Design a binder for these strands. Structure first.
Length: 87
DNA sequence: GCTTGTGTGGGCAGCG
DNA sequence: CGCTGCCCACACAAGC
């Protein structure tokens, strides 16, 4: 969301000082959308996929419509969400 | 090239 | 009081 991504505590709230854009889940690529679930391994699972996510969580390749045709790389999903657990 | 579709961008209510 | 769940309008890219 705007407040923060579905990651594990990514309070990366829109900060122009930080190089990130704000995208929505790959709604239209549900199967692939679903692995995002897996990377959102947070107990208190953040919003669904209508909320938005920021760029730092995926590979630049898979960023968005700039991928292959008009959406992500269907074989890529946010993997940069978080290392293990914040302190 | 312009219009339409999908992505982009952000919000409100109830309980620790 | 903030967070989670779901929706609309505009610009860019494709079609006519």
């Amino acid at each position: 969301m705007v407040q923060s991504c579905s990651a594990y505590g990514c309070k990366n709230r829109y900060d122009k000082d930080k190089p990130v854009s704000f995208h929505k889940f790959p709604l239209t690529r549900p199967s692939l959308c679903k692995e995002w679930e897996a990377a959102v391994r947070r107990k208190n699972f953040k919003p669904t996929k209508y909320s938005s996510i920021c760029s730092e969580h995926f590979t630049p390749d898979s960023f968005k419509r700039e991928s292959n045709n008009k959406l992500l790389k269907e074989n890529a999903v946010p993997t940069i969400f978080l290392e293990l657990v914040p302190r």
